[PDB]
Design a binder for this molecule. Structure first.
Ligand SMILES: CC(=O)N[C@@H]1[C@@H](O)[C@H](O)[C@@H](CO)O[C@H]1O
Ligand SMILES: *[C@@H]1O[C@H](CO)[C@@H](O)[C@H](O)[C@H]1NC(C)=O
Ligand SMILES: *[C@@H]1O[C@H](CO)[C@@H](O)[C@H](O)[C@H]1NC(C)=O
Ligand SMILES: *[C@@H]1O[C@H](CO)[C@@H](O)[C@H](O)[C@H]1NC(C)=O
Ligand SMILES: *[C@@H]1O[C@H](CO)[C@@H](O)[C@H](O)[C@H]1NC(C)=O
Ligand SMILES: *[C@@H]1O[C@H](CO)[C@@H](O)[C@H](O)[C@H]1NC(C)=O
Ligand SMILES: *[C@@H]1O[C@H](CO)[C@@H](O)[C@H](O)[C@H]1NC(C)=O
Ligand SMILES: *[C@@H]1O[C@H](CO)[C@@H](O)[C@H](O)[C@H]1NC(C)=O
Ligand SMILES: *[C@@H]1O[C@H](CO)[C@@H](O)[C@H](O)[C@H]1NC(C)=O
Ligand SMILES: *[C@@H]1O[C@H](CO)[C@@H](O)[C@H](O)[C@H]1NC(C)=O
Ligand SMILES: *[C@@H]1O[C@H](CO)[C@@H](O)[C@H](O)[C@H]1NC(C)=O
Lengths: 140, 210, 595, 139, 595, 210
């Protein structure tokens, strides 16, 4: 008995810092799951990059899950759940859970900070040209 | 029971009318008619079919048409009433009962019906009676009707002597059946037809529901 | 000159023999042949045979062969006829006949006077008498009732019919019928017409029919036809609510009819006014045993009905007809036992809202179904029977068709808290028994104080600039009475601006409840920094009241790292400002120092 | 097997055109139908959105706005056998911010601010003390 | 030396004549007189007469006169006897006897060997078989039951009796009886004693009695003396409120007893412990009309009851005792009077979600507060009175000591949507009247597309110990129904974890409703990245379904890299250090003592 | 049927016992007794009252006391069994049947009763049986009792031959009555008396309630 694997969330978008969970409703007595990672939609390597700190994967005998506590921007990608079913030599695979970590600083704050930074940069460039020009004319 | 048949079983005629009696014989042989007065011996009136005997008045005359012979008297008299029977060799007919009938107004026969008694049915057979009292013109056609099935043979008619005062006859037809055959029907009727009615009477009764 | 002389008559008995002589004169005896003819009444003439005087040649009929003997004397010119083994059927008149001419002996013109022979004329078998009753009730002017008596199994023919009443009075209106022979025995019938008035009013229930025969007289009573007419009493019976049994639960109804006179009755069962004949069972009609009076008759009809049908209020009718008169009776599961005056009375207790607002626990015995309000009295009786000062006001118009009134009495809070017995008595002159209604609240329900959490409007909601919805969630109060009321500045918002939910059980913890309240604020009265206080009152709270405040900018998204980010940017901005100002100061000072 | 290869999300702005694809490897006659399913092991039937327009079952949603967020799923089916279903393409919507200066990244802005700070400090310190010494030396 | 020699035996036929010779030797024939004596079985000897050889003088008996003739031959010394017209009664043994001495002829000492004369036939009537059963069940120790078979109307006397079982097994315990002549016909009876165990255990309901006769073999079944056994109870019948009009306010009560095989019973009426024999009329126990099966009988009993004690609710119990067991019944009570009515009837309409999901429109009428379940009948009727099919179901005997029943009917969506009215009708034996309810669809409604907002538990009030509570607020939907579902990890959560409230009306926004749905978590799984959705399905929605989501984090619109997170610390630190450097350079500037 | 009447119709006696037959004549004339063995012709034993015939053993002796005549045999033998009939002039008595009776222990006859059958009662008359089987003593007084009224004339008994093995006889009493007279009583009993019963048996049945 080898039922089809399906993986619960298709898209997660959280701010950095918060944990994230991905559930893979496998088949029970067919094999141990193993998650994979894929930064784009081309080809996926094994994510044995699970640090003992952040990534940790478990198995509740009908639901396997992976939690990433500290979400940082270098965690974007698609996470699969390839399980080596033991009735034949093939392996099933759930289809993807795209994690795109968001960030702080809502749109209004972003606009305000952009205007202020632009003003600061223009002022500093003006001072640069002013301070480079004034002594030379003064020391004629 | 014989080859000679006398259809005139009864004759209610008045003095002056013509009485017709027929006798059909289905065998070769001379036919003779004899008249038997009450108490007296029979007397030969017509011999050899149409030849009158000695002392026979010219009023009586016989005729032969093939196998049927008719003896008709053109003038009823006091001494002309009696019992008339036809004779053929050693076989004689049933006889004709000619009796006087006093003329009167046509009456209506009050038709009734009598179901079998409970005691009568318990012991043997059952009898169905149908009385028609105070009826003029003794000729009457009373036909028993059981579930609209005209019976024939099991009926028995009986006519009383003409009343001296009222000049009315009473006829009763007693239909006798068996206890094992009377339970197959419940609608029993006696169709009585006469000159005094317009349509034949159908006084009926239903067994069980009385 | 030809004449035949016969011997005299003889009376013989069965087994004996008879001899008859026939003397001929006026012609040659040896010339013509003599024949013997017997004439039996009601039967055709029978020829016993012919005899030839010359030589003694004879030829007897086949039916009489072996029992008839013919002899003659040539010298005496007389013939003889002997018939042995005589029987009753042989009783007839024996006559001797001679032909008109010697060529044809069949033309018997000369006949003798005849010698009648009677063999056992007297009737032997005793007649059997069976009364005859009219079968058809003729409706065509039946002024006379015809009754008859039938006599059967009578031998020969000897019957005399006489009819007399119970008072020995002879009946002259008797009409008999001619005797009829069937199966070797004679049968006769006698009929008598009796007046209708005499039969109807006479005390004789039967007439005496007398039959006289030689073998013995017999009497048979003929019952008088036609009886009185009585109305059929009708009764209908039903089962109570305990009379049903079986998997398809069913019971019976009875229509018992008595007093229907002639012989007849019809009974029919009808369902809801429509004729039905399934499961109906009518017993055969039987007479009631009564020692006196006219013979009355009884009948009982049975109908089977399902309890589902019987309890469905459907009408069941027994339809009976008698002599053209139709009678019906109705039965159904109808009780309507109680009085229709003011009956429904509710004693509404004081809610917790009432105790928190009016500062007194009031009992309210409200009387409904009231039609008149001049004699009704409302009194409140405590557990010990003492009464307190009630108050009355009676509603008018037709709020619920009928009128109504209110009875109210104020009692101390501790009395209600202790849960003593309290009773309101309602009395009306139309009520034979004063209805009593009781109310009390002694219980052991625990006091778990609620928890009041106030939630601001959702961010997705405020983006539409239409309205905002504030929720005052109350959770975890053990008695199911709460009182929520909002507060804008210092005065309560009008109670049409919020809707408070009913207390519902809490799935997380059995034995505890929760309730909500919802206030709508129009997105600018929220965006201009006003405050809203949700004042919850409950029994288990410290001072019967609490209050939570939520007013636009309180707190929210924590995001400690986000606040670190904002503080870092603020630090960077302020230090950029200070650095730029320091450069301005340094440059101004050094250009002052150069000039 | 063309499933598992569809994009896991589509990025689009409010009031813009959304193009989906169903890149099946069937026999160029299959009845493609586009649906809109819920999240996970739902209980409600999907919203039929119509066949593909023409080229390879492409779906064109126009004037995209906030109600159009959800999972979109084709159901290619050839002839009479059972359909084979794409995994889904979560369509997400937002309004893109504009930027007044030539948008110059954000970390690039911080790096340029720091570089200009350093340059400005040096161009303040050098000429200042240089011309203050020269004048004093002149005096 | 005197000896009489007779001829041999002869077999004659009825109507014929027989002749026998009697040769005498050893004595003078003309001296002694010879007589003929016939001896028939079962009858006394009869002397036919004496004959004198000298002169031929004879003297025949009166009974035999005319049919018997005596002759003799002097030379041959032999006598002759002729008997004509022989019959069946003449069959006997004819012997010639002579006196001992010539002086006394009566002392018949010398008799001949005898010549038997058999006259076959004469009546020719076959026997008729009539079964005989034991009339009395003897109270003695009878291990066998006696049965019999009586044969009658047998003209001759020759009958062979046999008994066989249903399996053609012959019965050896047969006892025959001698033939008895009655009215000119012989009657014989045969009895067979079969064991009681065989009759009570064998499947043969009757024994086959076979009688063999020369005129035809006859067989007749002999039923065993057994009957059915189960008769025992009775039913009572009350007349209605209208039925008490016998005169002043009187009627009769009827008790009916049926299903009785064994006749023996005793009928009685009781009233509060005393035997009642007043006004009691008991009928006969007649046979019920059954084509086949048990021969149970039926009887009705009647008491002329008074209404005065009926208003007093005096009891009446009708009892019978049959087969040693007493049955009981006592009619009373005012058709289940009131103050015992407690039944809840809920008519549940079909929701839109169920119609759109299961495609079936199932009206439901939930009935609770039942005390029993035998009589309850739930019927769904359409508006025009045409009843709709229903399927009741009784189960879940609750701890409240009540039973719950539901009757679910299915209808087409078209009739429900059109606004027709469907009326549940609950009837029960504990109710005085049917308990009707009515549901329909408010066709006059609009659609207004609710708005679903999902709310966090509490800013920091709930989230301090445990047990957070997230609400899914749904506001604005017009057609008064919704169905919210909660999901957690792609899987529907459980119907017993959340509580959704009824669509109450709103604060000031007339025409539309709102609802809620709270879910309780443990708060150890709320600050642990768990995500909950609230899927709300309403008719007016563009897709008839929607869903929202809250996990722990508000929202965000950046790419997590376009906000300059990785550089801000560097900028802040460098600006702090170079601001301090500028604050050291400004002093170096201002301090110069330039000439 | 005649003046001479024989008291004992049947006699069941063992070889060695004394058999006494009585016959009373109500007319003047010599009385003679003849014994008829089965199959053989009758043989004269006693003539002229008390005069022995030729070859008659001295064991058989006749005695006369006025009109009553008694013939007593003092020694039963094999050839003494048969039918004994008394003759007076041309009239003969009903006869006396002497039959062997094997001695056995006295038993109790099981008294039974059979009511009229439903089919038999509906058509014609009805017969009431009374079975008495397994009886050692042949002599029995079975008297029908209907409503405590002793019936006489309408009863008819029947006794079968003694069983070869059990040496027990069976008696059946069939009471023949009319359907129009049997319905007037309901309590029918057959009083059976025998040597094996201390008191007479009263096995009865109630009509209707069975
Ligand atoms: C004896 C019997 O079985 N009948 C009783 C009756 O006596 C009593 O009155 C009634 C209570 O109303 O219960 C039943
Ligand atoms: C299956 O995978 C788990 C996860 O690493 C591992 O602990 C376990 O040993 C594996 N099973 C086998 C049989 O190696
Ligand atoms: C009328 O009844 C109301 C309550 O229904 C009460 O408040 C008021 O006092 C009554 N009026 C009078 C005059 O009693
Ligand atoms: C009016 O309606 C019924 C009338 O029987 C009653 O039960 C109900 O309580 C009444 N309502 C009010 C508000 O008095
Ligand atoms: C395409 O498939 C859908 C899905 O079942 C079906 O409803 C539709 O009728 C089909 N269209 C065709 C076969 O043209
Ligand atoms: C979806 O939920 C139902 C609820 O019982 C369950 O039976 C079914 O197996 C679930 N489907 C999947 C694919 O897990
Ligand atoms: C086929 O290929 C791609 C599928 O994504 C599509 O862009 C292209 O237009 C399709 N063309 C045809 C002709 O189907
Ligand atoms: C997009 O159009 C309007 C714009 O807000 C919106 O109300 C509507 O619901 C959206 N969807 C459609 C199909 O118009
Ligand atoms: C496809 O399957 C259906 C099953 O109902 C069948 O009727 C049809 O014929 C099949 N297609 C072909 C081309 O046979
Ligand atoms: C009642 O419901 C039970 C399930 O609890 C079912 O087995 C039974 O058949 C139902 N009875 C009906 C529908 O009459
Ligand atoms: C059980 O009965 C009680 C009242 O006795 C009632 O409140 C409760 O609702 C009943 N339980 C049900 C209907 O499940």
């Amino acid at each position: 008995a080898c039922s089809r694997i399906w993986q619960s969330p298709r898209f997660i978008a959280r701010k950095r810092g918060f944990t994230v969970k991905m559930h893979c409703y496998m088949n029970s007595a067919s094999g141990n799951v193993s998650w994979l990672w894929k930064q784009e939609m081309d080809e996926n390597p094994q994510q044995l990059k699970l640090e003992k700190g952040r990534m940790e994967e478990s198995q509740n005998e009908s639901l396997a899950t992976l939690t990433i506590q500290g979400i940082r921007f270098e965690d974007n990608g698609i996470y699969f759940c390839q399980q080596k079913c033991n009735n034949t030599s093939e392996v099933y695979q759930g289809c993807g859970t795209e994690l795109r970590v968001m960030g702080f600083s809502t749109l209004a704050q972003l606009k305000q900070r952009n205007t202020l930074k632009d003003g600061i940069i223009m002022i500093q460039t003006l001072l640069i040209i002013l301070f480079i020009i004034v002594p030379i004319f003064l020391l004629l | 029971e014989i080859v000679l048949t006398q259809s005139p079983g009864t004759l209610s005629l008045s003095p002056g009318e013509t009485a017709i009696i027929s006798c059909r014989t289905s065998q070769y042989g001379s036919l003779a008619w004899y008249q038997q007065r009450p108490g007296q011996a029979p007397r030969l009136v017509i011999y050899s079919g149409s030849t009158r005997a000695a002392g026979i008045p010219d009023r009586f005359s016989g005729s032969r048409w093939g196998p049927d012979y008719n003896l008709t008297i053109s003038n009823l008299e006091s001494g002309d009433f009696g019992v008339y029977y036809c004779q053929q060799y050693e076989f004689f007919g049933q006889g004709t009962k000619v009796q006087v009938d006093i003329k009167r107004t046509v009456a209506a026969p009050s038709v009734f019906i009598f179901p079998p008694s409970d005691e009568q049915l318990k012991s043997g057979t059952a009898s169905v009676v149908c009385l028609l009292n105070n009826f003029y013109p003794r000729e009457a056609k009373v036909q028993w009707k059981v579930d609209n099935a005209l019976q024939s043979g099991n009926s028995q008619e009986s006519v009383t002597e003409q009343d001296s005062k009222d000049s009315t006859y009473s006829l009763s037809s007693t239909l006798t059946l068996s206890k094992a055959d009377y339970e197959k029907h419940k609608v029993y009727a006696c169709e009585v037809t006469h000159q005094g009615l317009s349509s034949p009477v159908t006084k009926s009764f239903n067994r069980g529901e009385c | 000159q030809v004449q035949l002389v016969q011997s005299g008559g003889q009376m013989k008995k069965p087994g004996e023999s008879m001899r008859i002589s026939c003397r001929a004169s006026g012609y040659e005896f040896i010339d013509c042949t003599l024949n013997w003819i017997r004439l039996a009444p009601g039967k055709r003439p029978e020829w016993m045979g012919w005899l030839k005087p010359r030589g003694g040649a004879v030829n007897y009929a086949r039916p009489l062969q072996g029992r008839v003997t013919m002899t003659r004397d040539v010298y005496s010119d007389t013939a003889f006829l002997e018939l042995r083994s005589l029987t009753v059927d042989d009783t007839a008149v024996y006559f001797c006949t001679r032909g008109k001419n010697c060529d044809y002996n069949w033309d018997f013109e000369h006949w003798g006077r005849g010698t009648p022979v009677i063999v056992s004329s007297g009737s032997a078998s005793a007649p059997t008498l069976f009364p005859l009753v009219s079968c058809e009730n003729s409706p065509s002017d039946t002024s006379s009732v015809a009754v008859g008596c039938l006599a059967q199994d009578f031998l020969p023919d000897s019957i005399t019919f006489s009819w007399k009443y119970k008072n020995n009075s002879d009946i002259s209106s008797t009409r008999g019928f001619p005797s009829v022979l069937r199966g070797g025995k004679y049968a006769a019938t006698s009929q008598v017409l009796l007046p209708s008035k005499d039969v109807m009013q006479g005390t004789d229930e039967h007439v005496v029919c007398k039959v006289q025969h030689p073998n013995g007289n017999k009497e048979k009573n003929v019952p008088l036809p036609v009886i009185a007419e009585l109305p059929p009493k009708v009764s209908v019976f039903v089962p109570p609510r305990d009379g049903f049994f079986g998997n398809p639960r069913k019971s019976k109804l009875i229509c018992q009819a008595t007093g229907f006179s002639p012989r007849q009755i019809q009974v029919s069962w009808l369902r809801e006014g429509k004729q039905v004949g399934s499961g109906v069972t009518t017993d055969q009609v039987q007479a009631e045993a009564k020692e006196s009076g006219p013979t009355t008759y009884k009948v009982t009809s049975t109908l089977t009905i399902k309890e589902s049908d019987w309890l469905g209020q459907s009408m069941f009718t027994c339809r009976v007809d008698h002599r053209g008169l139709t009678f019906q009776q109705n039965a159904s599961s109808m009780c309507v036992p109680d009085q229709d005056t003011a009956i429904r009375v509710f004693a509404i207790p004081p809610s917790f809202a009432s105790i928190f607002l009016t500062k007194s626990t009031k009992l309210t015995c409200l009387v409904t179904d009231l039609t008149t309000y001049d004699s009704v009295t409302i009194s409140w009786t405590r557990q010990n029977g003492e009464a307190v000062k009630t108050h009355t006001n009676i509603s008018e118009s037709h709020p619920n068709a009928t009128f109504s009134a209110v009875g109210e009495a104020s009692i101390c809070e501790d009395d209600w808290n202790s849960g003593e017995r309290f009773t309101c008595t309602v009395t009306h002159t139309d009520l034979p028994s004063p209805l009593k209604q009781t109310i009390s609240r002694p219980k052991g329900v625990a006091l778990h104080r609620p928890d009041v959490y106030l939630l601001p409007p959702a961010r997705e909601q405020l983006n539409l600039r239409e309205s905002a919805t504030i929720t005052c969630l109350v959770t975890g109060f053990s008695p199911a009475d709460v009182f929520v009321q909002w507060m804008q500045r210092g005065q309560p918002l009008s109670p049409e601006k919020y809707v408070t939910s009913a207390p519902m059980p809490e799935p997380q913890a059995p034995g505890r409840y929760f309730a909500h309240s919802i206030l709508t604020v129009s997105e600018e009265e929220w965006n201009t920094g006003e405050t809203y206080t949700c004042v919850v009152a409950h029994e288990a709270l410290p001072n019967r009241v609490t209050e939570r405040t939520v007013d636009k900018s309180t707190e929210g998204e924590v995001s400690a790292d986000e606040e670190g980010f904002e503080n870092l940017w603020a630090t960077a901005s302020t230090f950029i400002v200070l650095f730029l100002l320091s450069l301005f100061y340094s440059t101004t000072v050094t250009l002052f120092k150069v000039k | 097997l063309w499933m598992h290869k569809v994009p896991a999300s589509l990025m689009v702005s409010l009031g813009e055109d959304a193009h989906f694809q169903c890149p099946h490897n069937s026999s160029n006659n299959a009845n493609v139908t586009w649906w809109r399913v819920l999240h996970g092991n739902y209980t409600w039937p999907p919203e039929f959105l119509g066949p593909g327009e023409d080229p390879n079952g492409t779906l064109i949603i126009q004037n995209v706005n906030k109600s159009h967020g959800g999972i979109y799923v084709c159901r290619v089916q050839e002839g009479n056998e059972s359909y084979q279903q794409s995994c889904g393409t979560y369509l997400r919507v937002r309004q893109p911010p504009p930027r007044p200066f030539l948008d110059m990244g954000e970390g690039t802005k911080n790096r340029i601010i720091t570089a200009e700070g350093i340059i400005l400090l040096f161009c303040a310190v050098v000429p200042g003390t240089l011309l203050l010494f020269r004048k004093r030396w002149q005096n």
